[PDB]
Structures are given as structure tokens and as C-alpha cells.
Amino acid sequence: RVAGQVNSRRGELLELAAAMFAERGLRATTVRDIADGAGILSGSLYHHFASKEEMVDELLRGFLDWLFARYRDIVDSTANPLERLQGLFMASFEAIEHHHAQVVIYQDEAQRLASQPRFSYIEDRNKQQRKMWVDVLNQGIEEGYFRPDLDVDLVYRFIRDTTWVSVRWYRPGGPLTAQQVGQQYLAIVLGGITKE
Amino acid sequence: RVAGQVNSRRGELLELAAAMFAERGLRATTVRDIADGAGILSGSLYHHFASKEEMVDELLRGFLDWLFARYRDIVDSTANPLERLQGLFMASFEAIEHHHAQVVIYQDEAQRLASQPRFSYIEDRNKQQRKMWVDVLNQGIEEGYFRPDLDVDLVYRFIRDTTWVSVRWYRPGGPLTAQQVGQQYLAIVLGGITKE
Ligand SMILES: CC(C)(COP(=O)(O)OP(=O)(O)OC[C@H]1O[C@@H](n2cnc3c(N)ncnc32)[C@H](O)[C@@H]1OP(=O)(O)O)[C@@H](O)C(=O)NCCC(=O)NCCSC(=O)CC[C@@H]1C(=O)CC[C@]2(C)C(=O)CC[C@@H]12
Numbered sequence: 249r250v251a252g253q254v255n256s257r258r259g260e261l262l263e264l265a266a267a268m269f270a271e272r273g274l275r276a277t278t279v280r281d282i283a284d285g286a287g288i289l290s291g292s293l294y295h296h297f298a299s300k301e302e303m304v305d306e307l308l309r310g311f312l313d314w315l316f317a318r319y320r321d322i323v324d325s326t327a328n329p330l331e332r333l334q335g336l337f338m339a340s341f342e343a344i345e346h347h348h349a350q351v352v353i354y355q356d357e358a359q360r361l362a363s364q365p366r367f368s369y370i371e372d373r374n375k376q377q378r379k380m381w382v383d384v385l386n387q388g389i390e391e392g393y394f395r396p397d398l399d400v401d402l403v404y405r406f407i408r409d410t411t412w413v414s415v416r417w418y419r420p421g422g423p424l425t426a427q428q429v430g431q432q433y434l435a436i437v438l439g440g441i442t443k444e
Numbered sequence: 445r446v447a448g449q450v451n452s453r454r455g456e457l458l459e460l461a462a463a464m465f466a467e468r469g470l471r472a473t474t475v476r477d478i479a480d481g482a483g484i485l486s487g488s489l490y491h492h493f494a495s496k497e498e499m500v501d502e503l504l505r506g507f508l509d510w511l512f513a514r515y516r517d518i519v520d521s522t523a524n525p526l527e528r529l530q531g532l533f534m535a536s537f538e539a540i541e542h543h544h545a546q547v548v549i550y551q552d553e554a555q556r557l558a559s560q561p562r563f564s565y566i567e568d569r570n571k572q573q574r575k576m577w578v579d580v581l582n583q584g585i586e587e588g589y590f591r592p593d594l595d596v597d598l599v600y601r602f603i604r605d606t607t608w609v610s611v612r613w614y615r616p617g618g619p620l621t622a623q624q625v626g627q628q629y630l631a632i633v634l635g636g637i638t639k640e
Pocket residue numbers: 413416417418419420421422423424425426547550551554555569570573604605608609
């Protein structure tokens with residue numbers, strides 16, 4: 249549930265914090281609020297984390313390490329750029345389904361946090377997934393899977409935005425799973441970028 | 445530049461306020477900040493607006509009245525659902541190009557403000573444009589322009605999100621106009637929802 253943690257007590261507390269951060273906002277949530285939510289003294293919460301910033305650092309690193317490990321496995325296991333693009337696209341929806349709070353915290357806070365040295369990895373990961381997308385789009389154009397005159401930066405931003413921003417409306421209690429939503433978004437994107 | 449105002453002094457001040465709200469955030473901006481920006485006393489700014497909330501009310505009403513008047517003209521002047529959908533889609537990009545601050549303020553604040561009686565029109569307009577999109581998608585499916593099994597609510601949210609969220613990255617100083625970006629986003633959406 250919390251990407252990059254295990255079922256340890258720390259992991260339990262980070263899950264509770266992530267839910268609070270996602271619901272209330274990071275800057276609206278204190279260590280005291282989290283401790284109250286857990287039924288513990290603040291001092292006991294401070295036996296697991298040095299600060300709230302450290303909690304958010306553990307949440308975002310865990311999420312990004314999980315997501316980029318998925319991306320690595322997808323890139324390595326797919327046989328051509330069309331398959332690869334399909335799997336990379338669906339991973340956004342896997343993230344929304346299973347790590348919803350982390351996705352929301354990323355989208356609400358990562359751009360702001362990225363100027364702090366503690367969060368220098370947010371820009372590193374941003375560049376890395378952009379290069380990943382540009383490379384699969386270029387290879388798909390070069391081999392004739394995708395339409396030849398597509399502007400790959402534009403299509404990258406289209407894909408990034410389309411898929412990830414669905415976290416703002418997707419409700420896990422609703423009738424469709426995130427995978428079903430992703431499949432339908434994918435069908436549209438593929439109709440629009442494949443050749444023929 | 446400010447949708448729904450004219451080049452009056454009020455209009456000049458609302459433009460300055462909109463830019464500040466979009467840049468700094470509404471709750472981070474005071475009437476004093478705006479007055480300082482304009483070179484006037486707060487008391488003189490209070491000869492044009494009763495409060496900051498009234499400024500935001502004038503900005504969002506002006507924007508929405510402008511946008512929904514565009515939508516009305518597009519619906520009435522297009523000859524079939526495919527043409528109509530093309531024109532409605534491009535209007536998002538016209539809004540981003542020419543009323544950028546208003547779009548940003550909407551996306552940053554309208555959901556929060558909508559629970560206040562002053563902003564009861566935000567939900568009215570939300571329902572209205574959703575019905576507009578669902579109706580054009582249904583008619584296009586019924587007449588064979590669009591793929592027959594599309595989930596129209598899903599495609600509505602896909603279209604709404606795709607296009608409007610590009611305000612978060614689009615820079616007016618950049619090489620592409622918003623119209624060029626819109627045209628390319630449209631080509632992808634049409635490849636993905638048209639029949640054949
Ligand atoms: C405040 C709005 C109008 C809320 O939209 P909405 O009332 O559609 O709520 P939603 O959270 O987007 O979607 C909830 C629906 O998702 C459906 N849903 C949930 N999970 C499931 C599930 N698992 N299975 C199936 N179904 C499910 C759920 O059923 C539900 O259905 P409904 O009651 O209509 O039947 C909206 O602006 C917004 O912030 N929406 C959240 C999405 C969002 O932020 N996206 C980012 C880009 S979208 C955007 O900013 C457009 C602003 C656009 C613009 O900027 C200018 C002004 C505009 C044109 C307007 O007047 C209105 C729209 C305005």
C-alpha cells in the first residue's frame with residue numbers, strides 16, 4: 249500500500265501519514281496531527297522519524313523507487329516500442345490504484361519541494377522518465393509503429409498529463425478499476441498515435 | 445485580456461489582480477498587495493471592489509460568461525458532431541492563450557470556492573459543460589462519426605482533462621502557440637475516438 253515500505257510499524261505510520269497528507273495537504277498536517285491519528289505521543293512518533301520532511305522524503309522515495317523499478321521491468325521485458333509504450337502507460341494506473349496517496353502527494357507537493365537539496369532526486373527522476381518516454385516514442389516512429397511527424401515532446405507531455413492527472417477524479421470505491429480506466433485511455437491514445 | 449471586462453480602470457485593476465492571484469495564489473495575495481502593485485492606496489482600490497472575494501467573483505464570472513458564449517456560438521455554427529467537437533476542443537486553447545490567468549485561478553481555486561453561496565454558479569457551469577460534451581459525444585456515436593462503444597463519461601473526462609491541464613505547462617513566451625498545441629492534441633484525440 250505504501251510503495252517502498254514493508255508491513256513494519258514504521259510502514260504502518262507512514263501509511264497513516266500519507267493518507268493524512270493526501271487528504272489535508274502537507275502544510276496543513278503536523279507531527280502532532282499524525283501522532284493523534286495513530287493514538288501515540290508525538291515523542292513516540294519521533295522514535296521513527298526525525299521530522300515531517302523526513303516522512304515525506306521516505307514516502308516519495310519509496311513511491312519513485314517502486315515506479316521506476318516497474319518502468320525498468322517493462323522496458324526490459326517488452327519486445328517492441330508499441331508493447332513497451334502500452335506497459336509504461338498502464339503503470340500510471342497501477343500507481344493510482346495501489347499507491348494513491350503517494351501519487352496525490354507527488355502531484356500536490358513535488359514541484360515545490362524540488363528546490364530543496366533533500367528532494368534533488370525529484371528533478372533527477374523527472375528527467376529520467378521524460379527520456380524514457382522520448383526514447384520509446386522515437387523508436388516507435390523510427391520503426392513505423394507510430395505516426396511519422398508526431399512531435400515527440402508534445403506527445404510525451406500529452407501522455408504524461410492524460411494519464412497521471414486522472415488521480416484527481418478517480419475514486420477507488422467507484423465501479424471502474426483504475427486498470428479499466430487506463431485501458432480505455434490507452435485505446436484512445438493508441439488510435440491517435442499509431443500508424444495506419 | 446481579462447474575459448468579461450472592458451478597458452476601463454476597473455478592468456485594468458482586475459487584470460493586475462488576476463496576474464497576482466495566478467502567480468502567488470489567491471490566499472497568499474491581499475488587497476494591500478494588489479493596491480501596492482497598482483501604485484494606489486488600498487482605500488482607492490476599495491472604490492472599485494468591496495473585497496478580494498468580489499474581485500475573484502468578477503474574474504471567474506467574466507471568464508465563464510466568455511467561455512460559455514464561445515461554446516454557444518460553436519454549438520450553433522457547426523454542421524455535425526465532429527466539427528462541433530473540434531471547435532469545442534480548440535476553445536480550451538483559446539482560453540489558455542488569451543485568458544491564461546483566469547484559467548489558472550479557476551483550476552487552483554474554483555473547487556474550493558464552489559461550496560460558498562457566492563460561487564454557486566461554478567457547479568452550474570460545470571454541469572452545463574459536461575452535458576454539452578456528453579451530448580456532442582452521444583450524437584457523434586449515434587451518427588457514426590465516433591467509435592460505437594466509447595464510454596461517453598470517460599471520454600468526456602479524458603477530453604476535459606487533456607486539454608485544460610495543458611495550462612500547467614504552456615508558456616506564452618514559448619515557440620508554439622496554444623492553438624498549435626491544441627491542434628496536435630486534437631489530432632490525437634480524433635485518431636482515437638473517430639470511427640474507421
Ligand atoms: C471542479 C471540477 C469541475 C470537478 O469536476 P467533476 O464534477 O466532474 O468531478 P470529478 O472529480 O472530475 O469526477 C467525478 C466523477 O468521476 C467518476 N468516477 C470516479 N471514480 C470512478 C470509478 N472508479 N469508476 C467510474 N467512475 C468514476 C465519478 O462517478 C463521478 O461522476 P458523476 O457524479 O458526474 O456521475 C473540475 O474542475 C476538477 O477539478 N475536476 C477534478 C479533475 C481535475 O482537476 N482535472 C484537472 C484538469 S480538469 C480541469 O481543470 C478543467 C477545469 C475546466 C477549466 O479549467 C475551465 C472552466 C471549466 C470548463 C468548467 O466550467 C468546468 C471544467 C473547467
